[PDB]
Design an enzyme around this catalytic site. Structure first.
Site, PDB file in Angstrom:
ATOM      1  N   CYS A   1       0.845  -1.217   0.000  1.00  0.00           N
ATOM      2  CA  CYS A   1       0.000   0.000   0.000  1.00  0.00           C
ATOM      3  C   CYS A   1       0.877   1.263   0.000  1.00  0.00           C
ATOM      4  O   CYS A   1       0.495   2.309   0.533  1.00  0.00           O
ATOM      5  CB  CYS A   1      -0.912  -0.020   1.222  1.00  0.00           C
ATOM      6  SG  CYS A   1      -1.890  -1.562   1.339  1.00  0.00           S
TER       7      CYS A   1
ATOM      8  N   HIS B   1      -2.311   6.606   4.209  1.00  0.00           N
ATOM      9  CA  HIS B   1      -2.921   5.325   3.885  1.00  0.00           C
ATOM     10  C   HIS B   1      -3.890   4.934   5.003  1.00  0.00           C
ATOM     11  O   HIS B   1      -3.583   5.112   6.179  1.00  0.00           O
ATOM     12  CB  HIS B   1      -1.855   4.246   3.672  1.00  0.00           C
ATOM     13  CG  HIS B   1      -2.408   2.860   3.639  1.00  0.00           C
ATOM     14  ND1 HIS B   1      -3.370   2.469   2.736  1.00  0.00           N
ATOM     15  CD2 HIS B   1      -2.148   1.778   4.406  1.00  0.00           C
ATOM     16  CE1 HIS B   1      -3.680   1.203   2.947  1.00  0.00           C
ATOM     17  NE2 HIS B   1      -2.948   0.758   3.951  1.00  0.00           N
TER      18      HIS B   1
ATOM     19  N   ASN C   1      -9.493  -0.988   5.256  1.00  0.00           N
ATOM     20  CA  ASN C   1      -8.179  -0.916   4.627  1.00  0.00           C
ATOM     21  C   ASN C   1      -8.226  -1.593   3.259  1.00  0.00           C
ATOM     22  O   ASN C   1      -8.410  -2.811   3.165  1.00  0.00           O
ATOM     23  CB  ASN C   1      -7.129  -1.566   5.540  1.00  0.00           C
ATOM     24  CG  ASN C   1      -5.717  -1.548   4.957  1.00  0.00           C
ATOM     25  OD1 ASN C   1      -5.509  -1.313   3.771  1.00  0.00           O
ATOM     26  ND2 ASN C   1      -4.737  -1.818   5.809  1.00  0.00           N
TER      27      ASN C   1
HETATM   28  C1  LIG Z   1      -1.515  -2.497   2.871  1.00  0.00           C
HETATM   29  O1  LIG Z   1      -2.068  -2.203   3.932  1.00  0.00           O
HETATM   30  O2  LIG Z   1      -0.570  -3.584   2.824  1.00  0.00           O
HETATM   31  C2  LIG Z   1      -1.269  -4.841   2.733  1.00  0.00           C
HETATM   32  C3  LIG Z   1      -1.051  -5.515   1.378  1.00  0.00           C
HETATM   33  C4  LIG Z   1      -2.268  -6.363   1.005  1.00  0.00           C
HETATM   34  C5  LIG Z   1      -1.864  -7.594   0.187  1.00  0.00           C
HETATM   35  C6  LIG Z   1      -2.267  -8.884   0.903  1.00  0.00           C
HETATM   36  C7  LIG Z   1      -1.827 -10.124   0.119  1.00  0.00           C
HETATM   37  C8  LIG Z   1      -2.843 -11.253   0.293  1.00  0.00           C
HETATM   38  C9  LIG Z   1      -2.344 -12.568  -0.309  1.00  0.00           C
HETATM   39  C10 LIG Z   1      -2.849 -13.766   0.499  1.00  0.00           C
HETATM   40  C11 LIG Z   1      -3.546 -14.794  -0.395  1.00  0.00           C
END
Ligand SMILES: *C(=O)OCCCCCCCCCC
Ligand SMILES: *C(=O)OCCCCCCCCCC
Lengths: 330, 329
Positions: free
Chosen positions: A118, A254, A285
Site C-alpha cells: 500500500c 494510507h 483498509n
Molecule cells: C496495505 O495495507 O498492505 C497490505 C497488502 C495487502 C496484500 C495482501 C496479500 C494477500 C495474499 C494472500 C492470499
C-alpha cells in the site's frame, strides 16, 4: 551520433479522481458474531465493502478509470498510458493494465502493473509524473485497485476485520501550475514478513489440499513502524515540495488504522483545522486503492476542495513507503 | 498561493553495467523430451532451471550483486531498485524490498513492475524517467524469472520454451545520453494469448480441480510479434534520432528465434549488425531475457561497451516496450 531525448510538461497535477466501491456493505456486527465497539475503537472501521464473486481487481479498476476520465473531462482516446497498482490481481500473467486499457476502448496504449504493497499508489503516481515530464506520455491513468476479501482468513482475529475491496483512479496531466511534488520513498526489507501472503502459490500448488494461503499481519510491528517512522517521511515530502507543515490543507495517509493516523497527524504538526482523511470508517483498509479512495471521499463530501494542498503518505507491505505533496483533484 | 517545487535531475542517463545470474542445472532438449524438433521450431538447444530453494527474488539479488561489481559500485551507491518479474509467487510482500535488504541496502526505495516480457523495457524507462526527474541518481533495474515451476510438462506447445534466470543493470548519469525515449504499448484484446490459465484464488477455492499452468497461443503470439514489432523498432529508432543502418546490436526478447529472424529482416539493419541469440542456451526467460541477452553478447565479445543497441520487449498482456541504448559494462 547522440541518442535523442524527449521532453514533456514541466507542471503536472491530479486532474481528477474517480472511485468505485462495491455494493455489498459488511458491518462490524455482520463480520463479527460488543463486536461493533471492539473493532471500531481499535481500527476506526464501522463498515467495509466486499466485491461480488464475478468482480476482480481489473474490473473495479476499469470502473474507477471510467469515472476518473469523466471527472477530468476526458475520454479513453485522451489517455496515453495506464499504471495499475494492486496486490490482488491473482494471475502471474497477463498483467491487469492491458486488460483495463482494452475494456476502456483503448487497447493499444502503454501500461504495466506496479506492486509495492500500500505504497504502490505513491510509487505509481511518481512514475506517471516522471514519465509525463520526460515526454513518454502526455496524460495518464493511475489506478489503485484491490480485492482483498478472498485473501482473508475469517478465523484470523488479528486482521479479518481490517481488509476490504475497492478501486480508485486518478488522471495525471499537464496543469497551469506545479501540482505534484517530488516522490519521497523507501523501504524496510528486513521487516518483509510483517505483512505477507504466508504460503507462496507454488508451494501451495504442490499440495493444494493442505493449508491454503491467506494474508497475515504482525499488527504491533506495523503499528510501531508506521507510527514512529512516517512522520519523518511526511516532513521529507513537504521539504522536497518546498512547503511547510502549516501550509498543508489536507492529510491523506494510507487508511491502515485510525489510531496510527491520529498519531501521524500529531507528529506532523499540521494546523488545528487541517482536514484528515477518514475514509477507513466505511471503507476499511483497501491497500493500494486506499489513498485515491480516501481522496475521493473527501471531495465527494466537500470536506476537501479541488486545488487544496494535500500530503499523501502510503505505508504498508514489503515494508514500503511512498509520499508526496499534491494539489487535490476534481 | 503556495508553490510546489519544480525540480530536475541529470538529463544524460545510461547503462553503467549489466550483471547476469543463470542457475547451474542445464536441461537439454534430449532430457526435457526431439533436439532437432525443438531447435527447428524455437532455436533452443538447452535451458537452465533453478534449484528448489531458489526464487525470482534470490536470483535477482545475485544479478544485482554482479551488476554493482561490474559498475565498480556498492549497494550504498544505489538510490533504489526496480524488480521486473512475472514469477514472484506472493501477492505480497513485493520482491524489491527483500532484494534491497539482501544487498545490505534495506532502506532504499523500490517496487515490482509486471508487464510480461516487456517488463524490462518499462522498468528501464521508469528508472531513466525517475533519475532525470531528480527522484534518484543511480538505480538498479533487474529482470528475474523462475518459470520452470509454472510449466505443464504435458503441454506440448510450450514446455520446451520457458526457463530460469536473472539479469540486472545499473542506471545512472553518463557524459552522453545512453538511454533513448521509451516506445511502449499493448494489445489488451489478446490478453488470453499468454496466460496463467486458472487464477490463484479460483484454484485455492477449488483444490480438487486442475492446478494453474502457463498457457501460450503460439500462432497468435508469433503473428503479432513477427509482423508488429518491426514498426515498434522503427519508432524507437526514430525517437532516439538514429537510423536503422546505425544500429550495431539488435536485442529482441528471446521469445523464439524464428520470430526474431523475421524481425531482423523486417528491420533492415546492416548485414553486419549483431543479433542477440542467447535463447539457444538460455531459452525464454521472459522479463529477464533482454538484459541476459545483453550480458551474453558482452561475454562473447560480439557486442562492445558503447555499441548502439536496439532493444525490443514483447510478450504477455500483449505488451511491448522498446528503446535504443548504448551497451554497458
Ligand atoms: C496495505 O495495507 O498492505 C497490505 C497488502 C495487502 C496484500 C495482501 C496479500 C494477500 C495474499 C494472500 C492470499
Ligand atoms: C513473455 O513471454 O511473457 C510471459 C510471462 C511469463 C508467464 C508466467 C505466468 C504463468 C503462471 C502460471 C502458474
Amino acid at each position: 551520433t547522440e541518442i535523442a531525448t524527449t521532453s514533456g510538461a514541466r507542471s503536472v497535477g491530479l486532474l481528477s479522481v474517480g472511485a468505485y466501491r462495491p455494493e455489498r456493505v459488511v458491518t462490524n456486527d455482520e463480520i463479527c458474531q460488543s463486536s461493533d465497539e471492539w473493532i471500531y475503537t481499535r481500527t476506526g472501521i464501522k463498515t467495509r465493502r466486499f466485491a461480488a464473486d464475478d468482480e476482480s481487481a481489473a474490473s473495479m479498476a476499469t470502473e474507477a478509470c471510467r469515472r476518473a476520465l469523466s471527472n477530468a473531462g476526458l475520454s479513453a482516446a485522451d489517455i496515453d498510458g495506464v499504471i495499475v497498482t494492486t496486490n490482488t490481481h491473482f494471475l502471474q500473467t497477463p498483467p491487469a493494465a492491458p486488460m483495463v486499457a482494452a475494456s476502456l476502448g483503448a487497447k493499444g496504449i502503454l501500461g504495466f502493473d506496479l506492486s509495492a504493497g500500500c505504497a504502490g499508489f505513491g510509487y505509481a503516481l511518481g512514475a506517471a509524473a516522471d514519465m509525463i515530464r520526460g515526454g513518454g506520455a502526455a496524460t495518464m491513468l493511475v489506478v489503485g485497485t484491490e480485492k482483498l476479501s478472498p485473501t482473508i482468513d475469517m478465523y484470523d482475529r488479528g486482521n479479518c476485520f481490517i481488509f476490504a475491496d475497492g478501486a480508485a483512479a486518478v488522471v495525471v496531466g499537464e496543469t497551469p501550475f506545479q501540482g505534484i511534488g517530488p516522490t519521497v520513498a523507501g523501504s524496510d526489507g528486513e521487516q518483509a514478513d510483517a505483512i505477507r501472503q504466508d504460503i507462496d502459490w507454488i508451494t501451495f500448488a504442490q499440495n493444494p489440499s493442505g493449508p491454503r494461503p491467506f494474508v497475515r499481519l504482525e499488527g504491533p510491528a506495523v503499528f510501531r513502524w508506521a507510527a514512529f517512522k512516517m512522520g519523518d517521511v511526511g516532513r521529507r515530502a513537504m521539504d522536497a515540495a518546498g512547503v511547510r507543515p502549516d501550509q498543508i490543507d489536507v492529510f491523506v495517509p494510507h487508511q491502515f488504522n485510525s489510531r496510527i493516523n491520529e498519531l501521524l497527524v500529531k507528529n506532523l504538526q499540521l494546523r488545528p483545522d487541517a482536514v484528515v482523511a477518514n475514509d477507513i470508517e466505511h471503507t476499511g483498509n483497501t491497500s493500494a486503492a486506499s489513498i485515491p479512495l480516501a481522496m475521493a471521499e473527501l471531495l465527494t463530501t466537500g470536506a476537501a476542495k479541488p486545488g487544496d494542498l494535500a500530503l499523501l503518505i502510503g505505508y504498508g507491505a514489503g515494508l514500503s513507503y511512498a509520499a508526496q505533496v499534491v494539489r487535490m483533484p476534481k
